[PDB]
Amino acid sequence: MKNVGDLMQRLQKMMPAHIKPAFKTGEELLAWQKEQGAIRSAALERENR
Amino acid sequence: LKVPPHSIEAEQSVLGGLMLDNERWDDVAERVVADDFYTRPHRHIFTEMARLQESGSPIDLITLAESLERQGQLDSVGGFAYLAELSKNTPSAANISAYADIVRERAVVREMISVANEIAEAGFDPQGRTSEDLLDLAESRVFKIAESRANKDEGPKNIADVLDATVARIEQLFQQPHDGVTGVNTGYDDLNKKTAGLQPSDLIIVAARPSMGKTTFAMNLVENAAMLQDKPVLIFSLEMPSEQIMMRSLASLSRVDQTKIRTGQLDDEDWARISGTMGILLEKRNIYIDDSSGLTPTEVRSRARRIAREHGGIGLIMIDYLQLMRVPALSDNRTLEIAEISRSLKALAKELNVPVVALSQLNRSLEQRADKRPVNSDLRESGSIEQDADLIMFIYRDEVYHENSDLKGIAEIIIGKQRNGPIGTVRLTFNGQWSRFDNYAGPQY
Amino acid sequence: PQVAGLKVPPHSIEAEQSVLGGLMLDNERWDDVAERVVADDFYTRPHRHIFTEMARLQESGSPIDLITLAESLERQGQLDSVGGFAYLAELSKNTPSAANISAYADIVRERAVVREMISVANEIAEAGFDPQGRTSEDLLDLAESRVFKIAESRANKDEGPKNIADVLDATVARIEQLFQQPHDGVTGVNTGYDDLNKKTAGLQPSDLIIVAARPSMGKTTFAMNLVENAAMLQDKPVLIFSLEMPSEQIMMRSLASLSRVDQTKIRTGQLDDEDWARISGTMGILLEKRNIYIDDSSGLTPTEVRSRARRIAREHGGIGLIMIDYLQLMRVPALSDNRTLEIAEISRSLKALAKELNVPVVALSQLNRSLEQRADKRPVNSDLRESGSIEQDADLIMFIYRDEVYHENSDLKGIAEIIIGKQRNGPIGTVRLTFNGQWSRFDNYAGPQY
Amino acid sequence: VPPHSIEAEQSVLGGLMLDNERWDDVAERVVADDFYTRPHRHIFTEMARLQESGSPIDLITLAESLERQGQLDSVGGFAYLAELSKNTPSAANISAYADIVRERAVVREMISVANEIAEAGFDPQGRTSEDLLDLAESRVFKIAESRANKDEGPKNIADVLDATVARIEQLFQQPHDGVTGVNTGYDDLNKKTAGLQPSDLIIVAARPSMGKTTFAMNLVENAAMLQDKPVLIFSLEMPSEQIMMRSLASLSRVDQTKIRTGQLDDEDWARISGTMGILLEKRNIYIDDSSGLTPTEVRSRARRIAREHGGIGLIMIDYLQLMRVPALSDNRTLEIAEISRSLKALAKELNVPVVALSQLNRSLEQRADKRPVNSDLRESGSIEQDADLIMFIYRDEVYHENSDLKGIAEIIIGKQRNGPIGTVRLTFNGQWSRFDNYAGPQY
Ligand SMILES: Nc1ncnc2c1ncn2[C@@H]1O[C@H](COP(=O)(O)OP(=O)(O)O)[C@@H](O)[C@H]1O
Ligand SMILES: Nc1ncnc2c1ncn2[C@@H]1O[C@H](COP(=O)(O)OP(=O)(O)O)[C@@H](O)[C@H]1O
Ligand SMILES: Nc1ncnc2c1ncn2[C@@H]1O[C@H](COP(=O)(O)OP(=O)(O)O)[C@@H](O)[C@H]1O
Ligand SMILES: [Mg+2]
Ligand SMILES: [Mg+2]
């Protein structure tokens, strides 16, 4: 019904441009997730104590 | 003479026409899908073409072979020499999209044949099965084709064909204000939020001890959602017949107590309301009613499919006092009966892409606790509906148990389980002499 | 050989003979079979038409055996044409037990579905290969309607889901028919207790009333008074299931109550002329009417109750009241290991009955003796422990308290109050009635407010 | 006469020439040497060889590909080959015909062998008996060897051992990375597990609100981007249009709520576009929003995927109770046993893991500890005996609201076939349905 590039351009109407992900791939994203999770764990521990 | 019909010629014509024309691809993409073709190499070709028209758009002959190399599939689908002929042919200009139209048509046909074959199979091989669980198979498997502009029958699906529908669900919103709702509107602004609106695939349970207004509540919901929409609804009633139902719903609307209806002591200013709510129920013809005695879930599904066959996929259902629902097959034991029910209901809600409201009851062992705010353990039906469900909204109208309370004219909701969101607690009022809840623009909570 | 025995559509023929052999041999079962089988569920045309007659007569002309059937079958010109009389005799000759029918009608429905699905699959496939230049839109709606016609062949014509407008027409016609005549506050059945109709609007016609109490409050008397009154206040039947005690006591009590004389002047014989006058009057008023019907049974099930009631409904008129007494005796044996589920079953089934006929159902009960250790003793919704399903199904509950049992110093003598404890349409309240039980009847109480 | 059927023959060949799904359901039962005649044997050979790669075998693909081997007007040719397509529209039961074909074929073969035994018995031709009977043995055992389902049988120690040395060989030079199979990212969890082993039943099970469907989505969501190899999801609990919103939200670290409303900022839209486009150049995942299943149906879909391309690497079934095989729905324990055995079969078959979610019975509420164990699930331990791993969940802050453990989900491993028991701590944040590691104090 609608394919990838057209799907992406379709969703792009909802946003402004110059919004790029700057992620480009997967393992980098997982690294970023690891970092954010370990950030959060600390404040979580604070609130517990 | 008797063949599954495929147009291999026109298919390849489409392919080679897309090769030397990377522009006229979205228009074709409105019609053709990878599952729509017949052999495998054409599918590999098409899906790679689409994956590349995402990023690498100018592609005629060779970039496809390069990408096909980058995952290492050369010679698995013919090869470069094979592709040369696919390139040379189809010099067409005028007619491409008609070929796509007819090929999609052929796929619908082929699908119908395969389904008919599965039906006959399960006929010869019932596999320890009743007729009731067999007609339903057949009916559902046909109706799933009759519906569904896209999204062919049972079986898994790739991702892009799902992201289409999901981005459509997101994009339908921004054509209008968000309104808080992502589903159906209840008419209660206190409740749209913590529910995010009734999501239209889910089983709901509206449980309470007997005299708390749960039936009145669900009647109010289906009522309001009759007039914030233009679709059908149903009212199954294992508890009382169409007359009391009509009176109560009518009076919930026109705001005159039932005592001034069945009697006839009513005034002009009341008839003023009645004529209007009447003429506004008649000029829509949404509601349908089912005043049965003893139902099975099979019958429920049957009636639903017919009413959806008439016009539109329906938008809301109500079922009354679920503990009366029987199937004689498992009359020996009751727990598995409840389980099979809840299964059927959930699959229905997921079939027609609708919500369901299925009332219930609670075992009274919450009497002797002296707090009496219900929670998700007092209901004792194996917990087989503490699991299947998606939204559970108990009720506690305090001025039934206590008498001299400051909490009169109130019936607060309690939410126990939400599959897609949080829980909470909500406040509403009750004036049972004409049977309708109302919002509570009151203190903090 | 057997390979060519696979292309045959599945069928049974011995069951098909045996069913009709039993029905022609016995008419008591037509309910069950017609609740499992339809004309087309058979294989061929003769047995189909036979079943057609064996249902269409029992609509109105009940008897259907061998010759009372043929005497109708002839008038449509079908003797010696659907097998004929000589062959038809075979069905009545063999299998003379009528030992099992229901099983021999399940499998027919099974094979019938299994066959009417396959005859559809082939007829879809052949057209899917012979498209006739059709188009999908003109090709799939036929398949929809085809598959759905299967289930439509079974469904009774008047049990489906109604539209709003027809229901609404019924409602406005009801209100119209009311305004053609006085209202009295009543919306159905009357009782005789004007104090009661206001909080109740009469006994409504599609409900499950309950009347619970301790042993000696007198619930039984109250239910008898209700049916007794609704006899003379109607031109329509009633029933009673006196599972407690048999007819020869019930009618003494009822007669006596109607005539304001104590029982102990009847079975003794020390009575006046005024007495016998008031006796003969109520007698000759009961017997010129022929409303009531009684059943001094012993132990029962809802499955038999429905049959005994529907026999009455199909014989003549539609009933308008029922009473059931001391519910606990109603056995449903599969559950007798337990009791909670038993009561749930009974309540469920009686509700379904009453709605299947659009009539009221009085039904009595008992209360567990927990309240005694409270020193208030006015019963409430929490002291009846019978699964508490009766606390859910019922559209009405009306307990009974009467101080002059517990206490004896009473300022409240000869007075029985009615503690309503639930309602599905009206509101709750409390009623104050008087008791004079040497002839077993309750009465109104024109008195102070409460 | 030798017994041999001809109606079953024509029907089978026409049906496979009509419905190209059935090649599995036939070929499981039937062998090319079962037909009494040779042309149809050629035809069946062609069918199997094409369905190896080319699915469409009806008339025209079959005729045109068979043309190249120069075999027309030799099996009855075009018009007879079409006469197959003339009759038999419904393909009523391809299965039973295909059963009796094999039946009579085996009977005929064995009777032939017996006849040859007798004739060589009365006609020795300078033969011993001891050196003879090896031919009787081998002649009789040739039957099933003509049937052998693609070279399955009792392997020898050297082949097995070389498979193992090949494992260590491929594994050693590349970085050890801890993993011994499939990954999850949780570097605290890979230690007690060493990876979801490639051929194992895994089960996940905790009470409703403890959020386990989330955990399974997390596993597939990670293992996709760590691989370039497929997965599956069977959502018997909710349709895809919620699944993808949830998973997208999990990756992009933004709540479900803002999406379905739309009050989110460019900081979020960037992460959305990233995870979107990064899924949409891989096409790993495959979803099914079905409702009612049988394990056979499941096997069919899965094998379809694996035959279309390559081999899968994961499965995630959801809310296993709804999986029926209706023959036994009068009973429960036998039912669950059947699903367990069937999934184990599938799993060992394709050399895949399985992740089959479950539920627990509420009895544990009456225990005052509420840390589940192997007993609280009451299915005669049918899945318990069958697992190759189990790991429960327990999020404290449901029950004891005042507890000093907020968004701290532990993972109680209650059975493990290869490794030992253990315990893990993890953190739950249901705003976007995702677990994270716990770089905090001990456990
Ligand atoms: N938007 C949200 N905000 C807060 N909590 C949420 C939200 N969405 C989901 N949750 C929580 O996540 C949990 C996930 O439950 P789920 O994954 O369905 O497990 P199960 O399938 O066993 O019910 C829910 O119990 C819910 O409390
Ligand atoms: N006309 C009325 N006057 C006063 N109260 C009423 C009236 N109609 C209904 N109610 C009250 O509203 C409540 C609604 O109960 P109901 O809707 O029957 O819930 P359920 O079906 O679960 O019993 C009743 O408990 C009753 O007291
Ligand atoms: N002939 C009588 N004379 C005096 N009192 C009577 C007579 N018959 C009954 N009673 C009183 O009236 C009550 C009748 O109620 P009853 O029929 O016993 O109700 P239940 O069936 O609930 O026991 C008796 O319990 C008794 O106290
Ligand atoms: Mg109700
Ligand atoms: Mg009595």
Ligand SMILES: [Mg+2]
């Ligand atoms: Mg789940």
